[PDB]
Amino acid sequence: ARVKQKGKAGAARIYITRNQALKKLQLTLADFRRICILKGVYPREPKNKKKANKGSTAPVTFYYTKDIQYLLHEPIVQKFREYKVFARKLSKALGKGELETAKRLEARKPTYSLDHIIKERYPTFHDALKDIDDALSMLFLFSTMPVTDKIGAATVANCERLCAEFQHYVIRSNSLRKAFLSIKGIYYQAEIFGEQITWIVPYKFAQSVPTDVDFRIMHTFLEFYQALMGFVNFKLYNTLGLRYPPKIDNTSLFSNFTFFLSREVPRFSLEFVIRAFGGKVGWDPILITHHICDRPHIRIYIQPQWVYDSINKGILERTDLYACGATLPPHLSPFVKEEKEAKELSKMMMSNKQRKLYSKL
Amino acid sequence: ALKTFELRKQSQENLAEQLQELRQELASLRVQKIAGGSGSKLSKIKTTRKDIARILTVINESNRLAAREAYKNKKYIPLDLRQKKTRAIRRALTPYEQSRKTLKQIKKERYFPLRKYALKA
Amino acid sequence: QSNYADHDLWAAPAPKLPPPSHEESYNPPEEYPKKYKSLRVVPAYSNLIKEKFERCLDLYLAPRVRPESLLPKLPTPSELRP
Amino acid sequence: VRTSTTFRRPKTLQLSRKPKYARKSVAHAPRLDEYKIIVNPINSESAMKKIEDDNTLVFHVHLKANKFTIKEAVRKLYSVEPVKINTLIRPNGTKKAFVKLSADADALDVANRIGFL
RNA sequence: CAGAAUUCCGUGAAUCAUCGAAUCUUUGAACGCACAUUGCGCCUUUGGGUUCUACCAAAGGCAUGCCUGUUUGAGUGUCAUU
RNA sequence: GGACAUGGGUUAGUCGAUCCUAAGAGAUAGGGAAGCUCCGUAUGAAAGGCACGAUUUUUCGUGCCUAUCGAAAGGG
RNA sequence: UUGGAUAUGCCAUAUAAAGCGCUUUCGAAGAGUCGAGUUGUUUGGGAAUGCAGCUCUAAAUGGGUGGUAAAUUUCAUCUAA
RNA sequence: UUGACCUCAAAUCAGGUAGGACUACGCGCUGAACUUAAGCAUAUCAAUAAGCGCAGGAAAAGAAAAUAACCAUGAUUCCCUCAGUAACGGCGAGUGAAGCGGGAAAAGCUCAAAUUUGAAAUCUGGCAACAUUUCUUUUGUUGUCCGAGUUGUAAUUUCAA
């Protein structure tokens, strides 16, 4: 044959930069990032970045040409174009003052479902249950923030809906295993179908917008997580026999216990942990063996750390130790000449700069 | 001798593996022909070649009939599945749009059509 | 009509698991962040959204990639008389 | 605001072909497969000597078969790994391939198993 | 000429007739670019192997003018909004 | 016997072609011509790229500047 | 395999659509086209039969044609682009 | 700054179409010379051969801006007849139709120019249904969205009114 031109195969052929991917897919950067978030597409650095990137060494992001090829035949890209066409038609109707067709277009607004996207992103429901923790963390975080113009009230409502359905499922299935009270929040840990899942649920407080985040990234992540979470709960209810979506309203550690709560405790977490092990819960309408109350002044009167430590250890704790006005025990996380000669005996044979790794760490 | 209807009542995978077997027998017979073969083997060469043609025909009929079923009651179908009489016939006006008439002509023919008549002697 | 995931499916290779917690809470005795007597006194962490957003960026911008005494020789210099 | 005296035509979105039907009802079967590559081995006196000396089989091969397709066809038809292929177009217009077999296999047994000796 | 056979209690001989299903190599108006070069390319999907960032193979494609529509644009063309 | 008849014979990553351009042929843009076709070869052409960016009112912004064929004695 | 009838069943919203009758009535009618001159070419077409180039270019009972040029006046005939 | 419209582009955009061959007959374009004139230049050959473009089973032409001068006829085409005539021609060689009449065949019509204005009543395409078949290959109907369209798509009228 001929002298093959340098750079026609190998790293320069299988790796493609971000700008070249945009040109390849004919997508905007916003569209490309949305596709990359929805699908599983992340940058992959080469071993020889200079060889992959022509001859330059400036920082560029590399994607597999195979991954960019796979995105060419994705139906979501077409839905992006169809929405752009629909938006332009809506601008025409609003500009020409045809409110009737504006309402008709709003009714016929094109939407897409992530049914296929979830399938290829998680081949099996076990994999979906493995990578679910970030979704729960996000939805539980956004289930308490105030609704603003940027975020949709419907999306906020769906956040609490999905969170409540999952919490009810864990309560009725008694799938809760561990619960940790940290400064970050409350870290629940459950084991369903052998899969280990842990997630953080923050407290409901009067937070404020950081004014530094882009909600567009939040929006696309929220829509993906809501789509993922909806079918996961649908599989869970159908597996246990119940119908989905429901009409919202040591497994015997607390079975013979009728807990009652005071008006100072995180009742959302208290109800979850108690009813996860069969305990019955009564609460003040504004929101008996044990009365949970952390106030220093006031049915044995206990404190939430007693319940949480009992959940963690699977053993009833000391009510007297956790009595009101008493020092709280610390809360623990449940998921947590010859020598000198050998020092200069480092004459090679230790591969290339490897032993210092272990010594430093 | 493979009978074409017996072929027709078999599966695509069975037809494919029978085609591969028939090709292998044809290869061995041609090896005999170049090495010096008997009249019986040389006569079996043509029969094997025709059997392969029958297998390939039966496979093709099944593939094209499956395509016809898939494209049935569709506005656009593959060009090889469309009609091919002549190029001029395809371009011609259809009988429906050849018989299209204006509302003026419809009323004229509705009210004053050619009457059947006769003359007395 | 709003989709409610009405159908099931049975008729990201490397997730880069998030780091766990390092036993820092309201009043742990391991090390002394800040110590708070009661949970009510603790305010709301303002930056929590920022760290969650930083996690979002790392999900689709961070590239994903997935005992030592044998390395020294064994000349045994102890028996070397000099 | 233009800093260049030339006007280059803008880039427009180029949709890819999304046909409403297939132009062909069924894709054709691979028209050059292993059996069509190998027609029959050559059994002349020179071919026999190449068998016994160079460990090289000689085949009458299709014209449009290259050295790659000859190698795969031989491997699939005979389960022997060729180490080299040399081709020529004979003066009668037919391709002839010298398939040099690996040192682990001998062309003699391969020839007897084929049956063209 | 060889060869089979179809028993002759047929789905069947035949260089038979007939013909509504197919096949239809390289070409040629000849259509990826060429062509005294089995020359030179590109796009999508798929597969192969003692070899998997390599190499190879397969299938489907990529001519020009024009028409209806679609999508994406351009303009110190006409203007409103502001 | 260079005749006649039957057979056999030409193996390449490294030798050529293929690649490059020469004189020159030659489509496209355009203009002629009743036409066959003629002229034309960066011309009175919107003649194609490249990089940045948390993602930009989740309807893309910001910069940066010539076909092809034609050599088995040319180049390689 | 077609044809036109028939013998019937069903759908056919004829409020509709159309022919005829007399009107003291109105009545839209094709332009660098007709036409004219001139130059070529054509015809049997002869002070031009058609066609084409160029120059000039209407009209509204108007405009064509009535096979000898022109002006005026009648009479028929047709209704171009 | 958004938009609207006009104009102009681009796409391996959705779906289509054109080329090339045959060319006896058919519609044009272009276009000779030999030859006859006992020479030859107008003429003739000849509105021919060659060249070029474009169709069909026929094509073309066709329902009068047609004849006639009658007691009037009545789209076109072909046949016989007019008629080797009227006419044209170095009035030389030569060329040369039409009306009527007889027959074969016969069939008529469609737009533009009108306010639907108490309602663009019209149409393509996508999608989804049904349906039909020289035909699973053909041909549609209905529904509904986008579009085309008021710089005019339907109905209505065509001088015979």
Q: Do A203 and C44 touch (CB under 8 A)?
A: yes
- Residue A330's closest chain C neighbor by CA? C28
Q: How far is CA A189 from the centre of its chain?
A: 14
Tokens at residue B117, please?
């008549």
Are A331 and C47 in contact (CB < 8 Å)? no
The subunits that touch chain D, with at least 3 C-beta pairs less than 8 Å apart, are A, B
- Residues in chain A after which the backbone breaks (C–N beyond 2.5 Å): 249, 287, 298, 336
H or E element at residue A104? helix A99-107
Q: How many residues does chain B have?
A: 121
What is the number of other CB atoms lying within 10 angstroms of the CB of residue B13?
8
Report the alpha-carbon distance of residue A268 to residue A163 in Å, rounded: 11
As a whole number of angstroms, the distance between CA A303 and CA A309 comes to: 10
End-to-end CA distance of chain A: give it in Å, rounded: 52
Residue closest to A46 by CA, chosen among A7, A6, A88, A10: A10
CA D17 to chain A, closest CA, distance in angstroms equals: 11
Half-sphere exposure for A129 (CA within 13 Å, toward CB): 17
Q: How far apart are CA A96 and CA A100, in angstroms?
A: 11
Positions of chain H reached by protein Cβ under 7 A: 2-5, 9-18, 56-57, 110-111, 126-127, 130-132, 134-141, 145-147, 154-157
Closest by CA to B51, choosing from B2, B5, B15, B84, is B2
Q: Is A84 an 8 Å CB contact of chain C?
A: no
Residues B5 and B51: beta-carbon distance below 8 Å: no
Buried b (16+ CB within 10 A) or exposed e, A175-207: bbbbbbbbbbbbbbbbebeeeebbbbbbbeeeb
Separation between Cα atoms, residue A218 and residue A152, nearest integer Å: 11
Residue of C29, C24, C15 whose CA lies nearest to C60: C15
Q: Identify all chain D residues contacting B35, using CB atoms and an 8 Å cutoff.
A: 43, 115-117
Which nucleotide shows the minimum CA-to-C1' distance to residue C57? Answer: F54
Q: Is B84 exposed, middle or buried (0-12, 13-18, 19+ CB in 10 A)?
A: exposed
Q: Are D71 and D85 in contact (CB under 8 A)?
A: yes
Longest Cα separation, chain B: 94
Q: List the single best residue of C53, C61, C78 to mutate versus A (max A Cβ within 10 A).
A: C53
Nearest-CA residue of chain C relative to A33?
C60
Query: What is the distance of C-alpha A321 from the center of its chain?
Result: 36
C58 in contact with A, Cβ within 8 Å: no
User: Coil, strand or helix: which one is D95?
Assistant: strand
> Which single residue is written with the structure tokens 């970030």?
A134
Chain G positions with any atom < 7 A from a protein CB: 17-19
Q: Which positions 3-62 on chain D have a beta carbon less than 7 angstroms from any atom of strand F?
A: 3-4, 7-11, 42, 44-47, 50
Residues 6+ apart with CB under 8 A from A191: A175, A177, A197
Give me the CA B88–C1' H56 separation in Å, rounded. 12
Contact A40 C27 (CB under 8 A): no
Cβ-Cβ contacts under 8 Å for A120 (sequence gap 6 or more):
A39, A40
Alpha helices in chain B (DSSP H): 4-8, 12-35, 39-70, 87-91, 95-98, 103-111
Neighbouring chains of C at 3+ CB pairs within 8 Å?
A
- Angle, CA A239 vertex, CA A236 and CA A245 arms, to 5°: 50
Distance from CA of A1 to the nearest CA of C (A): 38
Are A93 and A84 a contacting pair, CB within 8 Å? Answer: no
Asked whether the beta carbons of residue A333 and residue C63 sit closer than 8 angstroms, the reply is: no
Please give the protein residue whose CA is closest to the C1' of the nucleotide F51.
Answer: A19
Q: Give distance CA A82 / C1' E77 (Å).
A: 30
For residue D115, give the nearest of B23, B35, B68 by CB distance: B35
Between chain D and chain B, are at least 3 CB pairs below 8 A?
yes
Closest chain D C-alpha to A157 CA, distance in angstroms: 38
Per DSSP, helices labelled H in A177-261 are 215-239
Q: How far is the CA of A65 from the C1' of H113 (A)?
A: 67
Contact (Cβ atoms closer than 8 angstroms) between residue D69 and residue D80: no
What does the block give as tokens for A222?
Answer: 């929220």
Q: Experimental method for this entry?
A: cryo-EM
Let me know how many helices (H) and strands (E) chain C has, helices first: 1, 0
Rounded Cα distance, B119 and B97, in Å: 37
Which nucleotide lies closest to A66 by the C1' atom and the CA atom?
A: E53
Residue A131 touches chain C, beta carbons under 8 Å: yes
Domain boundaries, chain B: 1-75, 76-120
Flag whether residue B30 sits within 8 Å of chain D, measured between CB atoms. yes
Return the number of other C-beta atoms located less than 10 Å from residue A22's C-beta: 15
Record: contact B32-D115, CB cut-off 8 A: yes
Sequence-separated (6 or more) residues with CB below 8 Å from residue B22? B48, B51, B52, B55
Closest nucleotide (C1' vs CA) to A32 is F55
Q: What is the DSSP letter of A96?
A: T
